[PDB]
Amino acid sequence: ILLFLIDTSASMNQRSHLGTTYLDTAKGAVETFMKLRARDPASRGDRYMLVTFEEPPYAIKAGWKENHATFMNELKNLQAEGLTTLGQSLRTAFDLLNLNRLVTGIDNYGQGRNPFFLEPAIIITITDGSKLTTTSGVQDELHLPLNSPLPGSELTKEPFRWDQRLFALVLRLPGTMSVESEQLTGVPLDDSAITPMCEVTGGRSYSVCSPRMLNQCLESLVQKVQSGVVINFEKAGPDPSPVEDGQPDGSQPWHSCHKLIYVRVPIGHWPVPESFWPDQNSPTLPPRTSHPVVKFSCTDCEPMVIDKLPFDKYELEPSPLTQFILERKSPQTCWQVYVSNSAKYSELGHPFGYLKASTALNCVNLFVMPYNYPVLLPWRQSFESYLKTMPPYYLGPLKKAVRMMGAPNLIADSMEYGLSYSVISYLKKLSQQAKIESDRVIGSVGKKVVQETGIKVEYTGFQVALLNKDLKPQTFRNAYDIPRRNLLDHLTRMRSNLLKSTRRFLKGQDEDQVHSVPIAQMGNYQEYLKQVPS
Amino acid sequence: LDNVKSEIIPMFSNLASDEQDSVRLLAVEACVNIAQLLPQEDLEALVMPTLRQAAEDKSWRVRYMVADKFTELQKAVGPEITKTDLVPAFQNLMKDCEAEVRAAASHKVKEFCENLSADCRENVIMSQILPCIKELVSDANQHVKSALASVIMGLSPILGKDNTIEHLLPLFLAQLKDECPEVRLNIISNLDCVNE
């Protein structure tokens, strides 16, 4: 799923050095991105959406239940007229991407946080350089407005989601020559108000300066689409305890890269449950975070973990692997990882996995382990006392693995909270109704706005008409659509047309055809008694 | 003669009974060739059953081919053989669902009538050819109508003066004031041969 955000604002009317405006260059770049992505044999399941800088009823051009034909037709007729309302457009796009999330089961907020339930989405937000306006002045903060929150959105406290990356294109093409071609293989950043918003999600922001640089950035962007598993790392709290082959001193601490969870839907178990201590009676649930604040500690702690535990291959995208490569990729050794923010009743973090590398030393495998592996792996009334340290709802998925061996547990203590189940079906129904109402009025514009609003300065109610583009005057049916110049000739033409008594008469003077004239479409409505047997 | 009677007839019978359709395309050519080469005394008992069983096959290709290559057959086998059993073989090629065989039969009947003797020509025309003409004129397909309009304006001198006003004028006026222009272009481009 790819949602292209093209502003089509009035500031996108300035002409480049090639002769076309920035909007035409953006549309051409989108078309070349389409034809480049079509090369990879994986573009048979994705869906394209379009978002412009227009009113909430008119911002979306093609959303759910819209094929490629209507999407291309809407992107073709894009007009650059309006202000640069970036915040409202980003909010509308994020709400559109989060319409079918509370109904299928993604981010249920009650049963862990399953990383194998993915809904990838990439935003391009092709906008102008700077100087965004909000009908009052020029702002320099880019704060997303919060006026009408969706039902069930206060449990994340952030507009974007687990898998929602945000790339940006500014299209800073000069007007005279664009002769800046010193650095060949180098794509700098835009350094604008959208740069922090993009970096928070996990995607960079390109700075287009030349058509060659545009082609380079488009060819570099097609290689950044996969399953979205974005997790945040922190150096705390080990004081860079990497004393293995050298001495530490770094910027590879707050790594917020993605992870490629390739399927073999995705197959996996043992998710990151949450970051708080869930109580048995809690009417209000604390809001989750889109990026989990999980921290790693550099300790050997028996990296050899061999068992019949179901295996996972959530591949990690190499972005800050320099710190690992400095220590020879940690051969035959790993380092634990633990989620912060009160992972248990009374403690600060519980190691639930590690980041052991592969034998090929190519990337990090991201070995996800159970909540507390070094205890259950090595019954004398031990498991009954051990199952009290883990979160309650967490007994859900692990028991499935126990199904591979037997079934000692039951549904006696399989209860998260009596108040968490309530006020959940109503929120899901409200979200479904909102998604249906949004998908219903998605393409039907029905503007019907043509007036001059004649002010005084039949009274207080007059309004002069405006020039209608698609008027289609009926010359043979309506007599008012016949001007004075070609009146007598048109009169004789109408007379001859009425006195001819032909078959299948029409009221159009000369209606040649539409913009498209297909050969197969016209040849299908015919009959040819021939087969060419010879 | 002996070489084609002894060993070529079995080969031809085995090739005519093939389960493929593309072989009949050339089997009918071999048949018309051996019919034109051989004399009269060795047709009514050797080549007739093969062409009869091939002209009524499940496929329409062999039927189209025998409809095309029919003038040579009717001119080589003689008039009597065409009087005995060629009438049903020619009639079954005008009442099919495919328009190709009907158009071919319409195109060929003009010169098929040219090589017909004057002993049973008018009888078979007013008794058998006339119903087929009347049922093919009112067809909905445009190709067969255009073929008829282009081919039927050659049988006027054969029927005579007192036979045009009988049935030729109604069908001519019907094909003239038709809905599609394809049949009108053919019925109006061959109106000089009916002036004499």
XYZ file of C-alpha atoms in Angstrom:
730
model
C 0.000 0.000 0.000
C 1.370 3.384 -1.091
C -0.344 6.716 -0.393
C 1.074 9.504 -2.553
C 0.573 12.958 -1.029
C 0.810 15.643 -3.724
C -0.104 19.067 -2.378
C -1.299 20.699 -5.626
C -1.075 24.084 -3.911
C -0.862 27.496 -5.555
C 2.852 27.649 -4.680
C 3.437 24.711 -7.077
C 2.877 26.831 -10.199
C 6.402 28.223 -10.612
C 8.167 27.012 -13.749
C 11.383 24.993 -13.618
C 14.368 25.335 -15.952
C 13.011 22.551 -18.182
C 9.795 24.464 -18.930
C 7.272 22.604 -16.743
C 5.915 23.552 -13.333
C 6.751 21.671 -10.145
C 3.383 19.887 -10.265
C 4.105 18.440 -13.712
C 7.539 17.298 -12.530
C 5.954 15.675 -9.470
C 3.398 13.842 -11.619
C 6.124 12.677 -13.997
C 8.203 11.492 -11.046
C 5.193 9.563 -9.736
C 4.713 7.937 -13.147
C 8.382 6.946 -13.392
C 8.196 5.598 -9.833
C 5.228 3.486 -10.943
C 7.094 2.147 -13.974
C 10.164 1.454 -11.810
C 8.209 -0.391 -9.109
C 6.478 -2.435 -11.821
C 9.876 -3.993 -12.598
C 9.982 -5.800 -9.252
C 7.720 -8.894 -9.344
C 5.921 -7.800 -6.170
C 3.578 -5.002 -7.357
C 0.540 -7.293 -7.738
C -0.836 -6.752 -4.226
C -0.108 -3.116 -3.439
C -2.751 -0.394 -3.672
C -2.204 3.256 -4.579
C -3.975 6.171 -2.896
C -3.872 9.917 -3.542
C -4.032 12.826 -1.086
C -4.036 16.523 -2.021
C -4.168 19.844 -0.154
C -7.931 20.331 -0.263
C -10.887 20.327 2.113
C -11.520 17.183 4.204
C -14.427 16.230 1.895
C -12.215 16.967 -1.139
C -8.706 16.076 0.082
C -8.942 12.367 -0.756
C -9.057 11.604 -4.487
C -8.664 7.803 -4.531
C -8.790 5.637 -1.422
C -10.103 2.193 -0.540
C -12.024 0.173 -3.144
C -10.425 2.225 -5.937
C -8.555 0.552 -8.786
C -5.560 1.947 -10.663
C -7.721 3.463 -13.417
C -9.522 6.006 -11.232
C -6.279 6.728 -9.363
C -4.473 7.578 -12.603
C -7.482 9.595 -13.784
C -7.504 11.651 -10.575
C -3.729 12.161 -10.592
C -3.963 13.223 -14.246
C -6.402 16.102 -13.622
C -4.620 17.516 -10.559
C -4.815 21.318 -10.389
C -2.393 23.393 -8.304
C -4.614 25.961 -6.587
C -4.799 26.499 -2.842
C -2.748 27.109 0.264
C -0.126 24.824 1.818
C -2.076 23.091 4.592
C 0.483 20.401 5.366
C -0.662 19.540 8.891
C -4.331 19.016 8.054
C -3.423 16.976 4.970
C -1.035 14.756 6.938
C -3.719 14.262 9.593
C -6.291 13.330 6.943
C -3.866 10.873 5.333
C -3.061 9.262 8.688
C -6.771 8.962 9.509
C -7.399 7.398 6.092
C -4.602 4.878 6.672
C -6.087 4.026 10.100
C -9.673 3.339 9.009
C -9.540 -0.479 8.801
C -7.210 -1.035 11.781
C -9.666 -1.215 14.700
C -11.915 -3.718 12.892
C -9.595 -6.471 11.605
C -7.674 -6.855 14.869
C -4.490 -4.887 14.229
C -3.346 -3.058 17.381
C -6.013 -4.629 19.581
C -4.338 -2.980 22.631
C -5.511 -5.868 24.837
C -3.503 -8.898 23.685
C 0.142 -7.834 23.379
C 1.436 -6.073 20.263
C 1.701 -8.610 17.447
C 4.436 -7.637 14.941
C 3.275 -10.176 12.328
C 0.020 -8.246 11.721
C 1.438 -5.625 9.360
C -0.167 -3.006 7.116
C 2.684 -1.303 5.249
C 2.232 2.248 3.995
C 4.691 4.772 2.542
C 3.973 8.504 2.249
C 5.863 10.724 -0.184
C 4.368 14.155 0.765
C 5.722 15.888 -2.331
C 5.449 19.563 -1.349
C 7.168 22.876 -2.098
C 10.305 24.265 -0.462
C 9.124 26.257 2.550
C 6.845 29.130 3.653
C 3.690 27.191 4.474
C 0.529 29.199 5.143
C -2.613 28.596 7.212
C -4.866 31.376 5.815
C -3.569 33.802 8.489
C 0.202 34.037 8.027
C 3.353 31.943 7.590
C 4.144 29.452 10.351
C 7.477 27.794 11.104
C 6.504 24.990 13.507
C 4.374 22.460 11.550
C 2.118 21.321 14.392
C -0.595 18.816 13.525
C -4.079 20.072 14.478
C -6.240 18.156 16.961
C -9.876 19.181 16.441
C -11.880 15.964 15.891
C -10.121 12.818 17.124
C -11.279 9.469 15.815
C -13.107 7.136 18.242
C -10.429 4.946 19.779
C -7.395 7.123 19.014
C -6.484 8.175 22.577
C -4.729 4.821 23.147
C -1.765 5.648 20.881
C -1.435 9.430 21.454
C 0.330 9.713 18.066
C -1.160 10.018 14.560
C 1.203 7.622 12.783
C 1.258 3.907 13.538
C 3.521 0.880 13.987
C 4.273 0.597 10.239
C 3.861 4.015 8.599
C 6.990 5.550 7.081
C 7.186 9.125 5.792
C 9.547 10.133 2.985
C 9.604 13.649 1.563
C 10.415 15.414 -1.704
C 10.826 19.194 -1.799
C 11.688 19.604 -5.504
C 14.105 22.519 -5.097
C 14.794 22.763 -8.818
C 16.497 26.025 -9.880
C 14.959 28.133 -12.607
C 17.938 29.120 -14.750
C 20.210 26.113 -15.352
C 20.332 23.776 -12.297
C 24.059 23.439 -12.984
C 24.791 22.081 -9.488
C 26.230 18.675 -10.436
C 29.434 18.432 -8.399
C 28.631 15.495 -6.104
C 27.544 12.552 -8.255
C 26.590 9.904 -5.666
C 25.293 12.086 -2.836
C 21.709 12.794 -1.762
C 21.633 15.447 0.985
C 18.694 16.333 3.213
C 16.162 19.103 2.668
C 16.566 20.676 6.143
C 12.993 21.948 6.371
C 9.994 21.769 8.710
C 9.056 18.323 7.343
C 12.486 16.867 8.164
C 11.798 16.250 11.899
C 8.326 14.884 11.135
C 9.887 12.456 8.653
C 12.755 11.464 10.959
C 10.315 10.735 13.796
C 8.450 8.184 11.667
C 11.625 6.520 10.393
C 12.059 7.794 6.844
C 14.473 10.391 5.521
C 13.626 13.488 3.461
C 15.275 13.849 0.062
C 16.253 17.213 -1.436
C 15.624 17.196 -5.186
C 17.819 19.704 -7.026
C 18.360 18.325 -10.558
C 16.536 15.823 -12.793
C 19.526 13.499 -12.431
C 19.249 13.837 -8.649
C 15.502 13.212 -8.960
C 16.126 9.976 -10.865
C 18.763 8.997 -8.293
C 16.418 9.575 -5.352
C 13.583 7.713 -7.089
C 15.867 4.749 -7.809
C 17.013 4.830 -4.174
C 13.443 5.034 -2.839
C 12.191 1.876 -4.579
C 14.659 -0.176 -2.501
C 13.081 1.010 0.779
C 9.735 -0.826 0.695
C 9.206 -3.972 2.782
C 7.409 -5.210 5.890
C 7.226 -2.433 8.464
C 8.701 -3.371 11.850
C 10.144 -0.154 13.307
C 11.591 -0.364 16.824
C 13.688 2.188 18.705
C 16.944 1.352 20.495
C 18.698 3.180 23.324
C 22.182 2.976 24.811
C 20.916 3.102 28.406
C 21.952 1.702 30.603
C 25.393 0.152 30.122
C 27.700 3.175 29.571
C 28.858 1.618 26.274
C 30.029 -1.662 27.812
C 31.440 -2.907 24.503
C 34.897 -3.746 25.919
C 35.422 -6.773 23.678
C 38.079 -5.852 21.097
C 38.596 -2.090 21.602
C 37.506 0.874 23.736
C 34.176 2.605 23.166
C 33.612 6.361 23.145
C 28.722 7.587 19.890
C 25.869 8.381 17.496
C 24.615 4.798 16.985
C 22.458 4.937 20.114
C 18.945 6.118 19.179
C 18.495 3.786 16.224
C 14.926 3.969 14.888
C 15.307 1.789 11.797
C 12.835 -0.741 10.411
C 12.934 -4.536 10.298
C 12.041 -6.828 7.391
C 9.552 -9.423 8.664
C 9.311 -11.536 5.522
C 6.634 -14.226 5.569
C 7.182 -17.893 4.748
C 0.388 -13.132 6.124
C 3.463 -13.114 8.349
C 4.113 -16.083 10.647
C 5.511 -15.539 14.120
C 4.917 -15.648 17.850
C 6.131 -14.099 21.129
C 5.254 -10.418 20.605
C 6.313 -7.416 22.658
C 3.395 -7.273 25.134
C 3.311 -3.655 26.374
C 5.125 -1.004 28.454
C 3.317 -0.760 31.817
C 2.034 -2.997 34.597
C -1.544 -4.015 33.684
C -3.925 -4.287 36.631
C -6.922 -6.582 36.986
C -9.346 -3.638 37.348
C -8.470 -0.702 35.071
C -11.277 1.285 33.405
C -8.869 3.594 31.549
C -6.013 2.022 29.587
C -2.695 3.900 29.299
C -1.950 5.014 25.732
C 0.595 2.897 23.887
C 3.497 4.193 21.797
C 3.929 3.650 18.069
C 7.672 3.111 18.562
C 8.486 0.787 21.490
C 11.177 2.165 23.805
C 13.227 -1.035 24.101
C 16.814 -0.945 25.367
C 19.711 -3.378 25.016
C 22.494 -4.286 27.446
C 25.894 -5.573 26.313
C 26.209 -8.848 28.234
C 27.253 -12.288 27.001
C 24.845 -14.189 29.304
C 24.979 -17.609 27.565
C 24.205 -16.584 23.954
C 23.766 -20.278 23.031
C 19.989 -20.845 23.161
C 19.043 -24.138 21.470
C 15.590 -25.653 22.001
C 12.376 -26.676 20.236
C 11.148 -23.086 20.591
C 9.412 -21.875 17.399
C 11.920 -19.982 15.275
C 11.639 -16.407 13.996
C 13.545 -14.565 11.246
C 12.544 -10.920 11.634
C 15.427 -9.480 9.612
C 16.728 -6.103 10.796
C 17.508 -3.433 8.214
C 21.166 -2.329 8.502
C 21.242 1.340 9.499
C 23.470 1.546 12.606
C 25.434 -1.693 12.204
C 28.754 0.176 12.456
C 28.816 -0.230 16.244
C 28.403 -3.991 15.811
C 30.938 -4.190 12.971
C 33.503 -2.408 15.158
C 33.431 -5.480 17.439
C 33.796 -8.013 14.580
C 29.984 -8.426 14.513
C 30.240 -10.169 17.925
C 31.108 -13.698 16.721
C 29.412 -16.452 18.746
C 28.189 -13.883 21.283
C 25.191 -11.596 21.707
C 23.756 -8.927 24.009
C 20.426 -8.955 25.828
C 17.582 -6.513 25.184
C 14.762 -5.364 27.442
C 11.762 -3.056 27.225
C 11.629 -0.146 29.668
C 8.765 1.735 31.382
C 7.733 -0.765 34.068
C 7.731 -4.033 32.135
C 6.793 -5.828 35.380
C 5.143 -5.070 38.737
C 8.252 -3.752 40.540
C 11.401 -3.644 38.380
C 13.039 -1.535 35.665
C 13.200 -3.653 32.520
C 13.175 -7.421 31.969
C 15.465 -9.085 29.392
C 13.240 -10.848 26.864
C 15.580 -11.337 23.904
C 18.900 -10.563 22.271
C 20.402 -9.324 18.996
C 22.613 -12.229 17.942
C 24.040 -11.964 14.429
C 24.054 -14.664 11.766
C 26.953 -16.876 10.718
C 27.346 -14.923 7.465
C 27.705 -11.678 9.488
C 25.489 -9.837 6.994
C 22.723 -8.327 9.157
C 21.125 -8.724 12.584
C 18.578 -11.535 12.857
C 16.672 -9.949 15.786
C 16.144 -13.148 17.764
C 12.916 -12.501 19.679
C 12.652 -14.599 22.847
C 9.831 -15.138 25.372
C 9.242 -12.709 28.241
C 11.732 -14.574 30.460
C 13.597 -17.355 28.641
C 16.598 -18.173 30.918
C 14.237 -19.577 33.599
C 11.561 -21.604 31.797
C 14.104 -23.275 29.495
C 16.330 -24.974 32.109
C 7.587 -29.954 37.781
C 8.198 -29.940 41.565
C 5.706 -27.049 41.898
C 7.970 -24.641 40.001
C 6.002 -23.546 36.924
C 3.010 -22.543 39.065
C 5.210 -20.108 40.998
C 7.109 -19.010 37.880
C 3.983 -18.018 35.931
C 3.373 -15.116 38.378
C 6.212 -12.912 37.077
C 4.839 -12.693 33.502
C 1.928 -10.463 32.472
C -1.479 -12.170 32.653
C -2.624 -11.763 29.042
C 0.825 -12.978 27.965
C -0.284 -16.530 28.801
C -2.329 -16.414 25.590
C 0.253 -16.932 22.842
C 2.797 -18.991 24.800
C 0.168 -21.636 25.582
C -0.169 -22.247 21.836
C 3.484 -23.313 21.827
C 2.703 -25.571 24.792
C 0.108 -27.131 22.482
C 3.068 -28.673 20.634
C 3.795 -30.760 23.757
C 0.592 -31.005 25.794
C -2.044 -28.919 27.544
C -1.546 -28.367 31.299
C -3.198 -24.925 31.382
C -6.843 -23.920 30.940
C -9.122 -20.880 30.681
C -9.401 -20.407 34.463
C -6.896 -17.536 34.751
C -7.058 -16.419 31.090
C -8.536 -13.007 31.857
C -6.857 -9.656 31.187
C -9.245 -7.190 32.854
C -12.990 -7.001 33.448
C -13.048 -3.314 32.452
C -10.764 -3.573 29.408
C -13.275 -5.726 27.516
C -16.023 -3.139 28.012
C -16.229 0.022 25.881
C -14.349 -1.831 23.110
C -17.046 -3.179 20.781
C -18.740 0.230 20.659
C -15.452 1.879 19.673
C -14.940 -0.729 16.946
C -18.469 -0.152 15.635
C -17.914 3.616 15.626
C -14.617 3.188 13.768
C -16.299 0.917 11.213
C -19.107 3.440 10.700
C -16.573 6.252 10.269
C -14.571 4.200 7.760
C -17.745 3.406 5.810
C -18.788 7.072 5.779
C -15.303 8.070 4.600
C -15.143 5.442 1.843
C -18.675 6.307 0.685
C -18.066 10.006 -0.040
C -14.592 9.625 -1.533
C -15.028 10.399 -5.248
C -18.428 12.153 -5.394
C -17.401 15.809 -5.199
C -20.706 17.577 -5.984
C -19.242 21.057 -5.585
C -22.069 23.061 -7.214
C -20.341 26.375 -6.449
C -20.737 28.981 -9.205
C -21.650 32.489 -8.050
C -20.183 35.988 -7.919
C -21.906 37.130 -4.684
C -22.973 40.584 -5.861
C -22.680 42.859 -2.822
C -24.723 46.010 -2.276
C -21.973 48.298 -0.916
C -34.243 40.604 -5.547
C -32.162 42.383 -2.910
C -29.596 40.570 -0.740
C -30.217 37.398 -2.774
C -28.678 38.030 -6.218
C -25.531 36.296 -7.459
C -24.065 36.488 -10.955
C -23.197 33.199 -12.627
C -19.685 32.022 -13.479
C -18.181 30.424 -16.571
C -18.991 26.704 -16.584
C -16.284 24.483 -18.061
C -18.286 21.300 -18.723
C -21.505 22.968 -19.843
C -22.174 20.984 -23.059
C -24.725 23.362 -24.638
C -27.591 21.620 -26.440
C -27.793 23.504 -29.733
C -30.609 21.444 -31.271
C -32.644 21.020 -28.067
C -32.169 24.422 -26.391
C -32.676 27.592 -28.427
C -30.888 29.834 -25.907
C -27.526 28.164 -26.638
C -27.536 29.455 -30.243
C -25.577 32.739 -30.519
C -26.473 35.531 -32.934
C -23.618 35.078 -35.427
C -24.359 31.526 -36.609
C -28.131 31.683 -36.199
C -29.603 31.499 -39.711
C -27.224 28.748 -40.839
C -27.895 26.858 -37.609
C -31.620 27.449 -38.151
C -31.431 25.839 -41.596
C -29.348 23.012 -40.119
C -31.941 22.311 -37.415
C -34.708 22.494 -40.025
C -32.967 19.971 -42.283
C -32.232 17.717 -39.297
C -35.872 17.746 -38.182
C -37.322 17.313 -41.687
C -34.956 14.445 -42.559
C -36.748 11.811 -40.423
C -33.579 9.744 -40.037
C -32.877 6.988 -37.494
C -31.405 7.541 -34.015
C -31.602 11.326 -34.035
C -29.608 13.392 -31.547
C -29.538 16.936 -30.181
C -25.771 17.464 -30.528
C -24.492 19.526 -33.448
C -21.007 17.985 -33.668
C -19.975 15.530 -30.932
C -16.927 13.826 -32.444
C -15.666 11.705 -29.528
C -14.149 11.864 -26.050
C -10.466 12.236 -25.159
C -9.788 8.493 -25.488
C -10.549 6.467 -28.635
C -9.752 2.794 -28.075
C -9.544 0.369 -30.986
C -10.710 -2.777 -29.185
C -13.609 -0.935 -27.535
C -14.941 0.143 -30.936
C -14.172 -3.184 -32.640
C -16.002 -5.187 -29.956
C -19.366 -3.634 -30.898
C -19.314 -5.148 -34.383
C -19.755 -8.449 -36.222
C -17.184 -10.027 -38.553
C -18.168 -13.372 -40.103
C -14.580 -14.499 -40.604
C -12.040 -16.664 -38.795
C -8.993 -16.848 -41.135
C -8.698 -20.630 -41.139
C -5.991 -20.516 -43.826
C -5.286 -45.953 -63.595
C -4.353 -49.203 -61.837
C -1.847 -47.465 -59.555
C -4.428 -44.952 -58.311
C -7.150 -47.621 -58.041
C -5.065 -50.146 -56.090
C -3.042 -48.211 -53.506
C -3.992 -44.522 -53.699
C -7.661 -45.135 -52.815
C -6.836 -46.834 -49.464
C -4.379 -44.046 -48.593
C -6.980 -41.417 -49.438
C -9.635 -43.202 -47.373
C -7.283 -43.367 -44.380
C -6.349 -39.688 -44.737
C -10.009 -38.677 -45.057
C -10.888 -40.443 -41.784
C -8.214 -38.563 -39.818
C -9.113 -37.105 -36.423
C -7.490 -33.774 -37.376
C -9.128 -30.906 -39.248
C -6.067 -29.357 -40.918
C -5.502 -32.455 -43.065
C -8.897 -32.163 -44.787
C -7.901 -28.691 -46.037
C -5.580 -30.506 -48.459
C -7.459 -33.817 -48.655
C -10.257 -31.994 -50.480
C -7.656 -30.594 -52.892
C -6.309 -34.095 -53.518
C -9.906 -35.249 -54.040
C -10.745 -32.586 -56.619
C -7.409 -33.253 -58.343
C -8.022 -36.993 -58.689
C -11.618 -36.285 -59.743
C -10.474 -33.960 -62.532
C -7.716 -36.358 -63.623
C -9.705 -39.601 -63.602
C -12.303 -40.347 -66.319
C -16.062 -40.578 -65.780
C -16.237 -44.366 -65.332
C -14.426 -44.275 -61.952
C -16.154 -41.517 -59.964
C -19.660 -42.643 -58.944
C -18.262 -45.563 -56.902
C -14.821 -44.493 -55.621
C -14.652 -40.794 -54.698
C -18.324 -40.021 -53.932
C -18.569 -41.664 -50.468
C -15.382 -39.942 -49.290
C -16.529 -36.446 -50.257
C -20.013 -37.198 -48.904
C -18.669 -38.224 -45.490
C -16.198 -35.311 -45.484
C -18.695 -32.588 -46.442
C -20.801 -33.409 -43.352
C -18.006 -33.464 -40.777
C -18.159 -31.970 -37.288
C -15.813 -29.151 -38.346
C -16.662 -26.214 -40.602
C -13.251 -25.918 -42.294
C -13.678 -28.948 -44.564
C -17.238 -27.812 -45.306
C -15.957 -24.368 -46.300
C -13.296 -25.975 -48.502
C -15.731 -28.276 -50.298
C -18.077 -25.304 -50.741
C -15.257 -23.325 -52.373
C -13.951 -26.177 -54.553
C -17.302 -27.297 -55.949
C -17.360 -25.961 -59.523
C -14.526 -28.292 -60.532
C -16.386 -31.225 -58.964
C -19.672 -30.417 -60.702
C -17.880 -29.910 -64.035
C -15.752 -33.073 -63.785
C -18.312 -35.591 -62.502
C -20.736 -34.542 -65.243
C -24.353 -33.393 -65.091
C -25.907 -36.775 -64.274
C -23.814 -37.280 -61.127
C -24.807 -33.785 -60.001
C -28.421 -34.810 -60.634
C -28.208 -37.998 -58.548
C -26.636 -37.045 -55.217
C -24.946 -33.625 -55.418
C -28.228 -31.806 -54.674
C -28.296 -32.816 -50.968
C -24.545 -32.242 -50.632
C -25.056 -28.715 -51.979
C -28.168 -28.094 -49.865
C -26.540 -29.087 -46.561
C -23.909 -26.368 -47.154
C -26.486 -23.552 -47.265
C -28.384 -24.331 -44.050
C -25.531 -24.309 -41.527
C -24.911 -22.100 -38.508
C -21.610 -20.747 -39.854
C -21.969 -17.944 -42.391
C -18.734 -18.845 -44.204
C -20.109 -22.011 -45.819
C -23.330 -20.222 -46.788
C -21.440 -17.307 -48.350
C -19.190 -19.738 -50.230
C -22.162 -21.714 -51.560
C -23.846 -18.469 -52.621
C -20.693 -17.306 -54.412
C -20.266 -20.659 -56.175
C -23.881 -21.381 -57.179
C -23.769 -18.723 -59.919
C -21.150 -20.574 -61.966
C -22.459 -23.938 -60.755
C -25.709 -23.170 -62.590
C -23.721 -22.174 -65.698
C -22.480 -25.753 -66.222
C -25.939 -27.294 -65.708
C -27.828 -28.933 -68.561
C -31.151 -27.538 -69.775
C -33.154 -30.688 -68.946
C -33.728 -30.149 -65.204
C -32.251 -26.685 -64.610
C -35.440 -24.623 -64.314
C -37.154 -27.375 -62.307
C -34.420 -27.601 -59.668
C -34.171 -23.795 -59.638
C -37.889 -23.163 -59.061
C -38.258 -26.136 -56.700
C -35.043 -26.295 -54.645
C -32.846 -23.248 -55.309
C -35.696 -20.762 -54.808
C -36.489 -21.726 -51.167
C -32.796 -21.552 -50.250
C -32.482 -18.148 -51.931
C -35.594 -16.879 -50.140
C -34.359 -18.138 -46.759
C -30.835 -16.755 -47.268
C -32.007 -13.306 -48.396
C -33.891 -12.702 -45.126
C -30.868 -13.693 -43.015
C -29.624 -11.369 -40.281
C -25.933 -11.776 -41.142
C -24.573 -9.057 -43.418
C -21.794 -11.054 -45.104
C -24.149 -13.610 -46.665
C -26.517 -10.831 -47.752
C -23.683 -8.921 -49.436
C -22.454 -12.116 -51.103
C -25.954 -12.846 -52.421
C -26.392 -9.274 -53.662
C -23.054 -9.505 -55.480
C -23.553 -13.008 -56.917
C -27.267 -13.281 -57.830
C -27.186 -10.625 -60.570
C -25.532 -13.138 -62.889
C -28.363 -15.673 -63.049
C -30.740 -13.313 -64.880
C -29.818 -14.304 -68.486
C -30.043 -17.983 -67.495
C -33.619 -17.827 -66.194
C -34.912 -15.727 -69.100
C -37.101 -12.676 -69.517
C -40.337 -14.197 -68.171
C -38.574 -15.378 -64.984
C -37.108 -12.123 -63.626
C -40.485 -10.565 -62.781
C -41.529 -13.828 -61.104
C -39.105 -13.902 -58.160
C -35.942 -11.948 -59.050
C -37.601 -8.522 -58.752
C -38.921 -9.076 -55.184
C -35.533 -10.199 -53.851
C -33.787 -7.422 -55.795
C -36.061 -4.765 -54.290
C -35.619 -6.348 -50.852
C -31.815 -6.316 -51.049
C -31.855 -2.804 -52.538
C -33.751 -1.108 -49.688
C -31.863 -2.787 -46.852
C -30.496 -1.488 -43.552
C -26.813 -2.082 -44.038
C -24.847 -0.304 -46.792
C -22.573 -3.311 -47.399
C -25.328 -5.229 -49.192
C -26.458 -2.107 -51.076
C -22.952 -1.477 -52.430
C -23.037 -4.987 -53.925
C -26.639 -4.942 -55.172
C -26.080 -1.567 -56.892
C -22.702 -2.375 -58.497
C -24.109 -5.221 -60.639
C -27.248 -3.674 -62.149
C -25.994 -3.349 -65.741
C -26.208 -7.080 -66.532
C -29.987 -7.042 -65.938
C -30.566 -4.211 -68.432
C -30.504 -6.442 -71.528
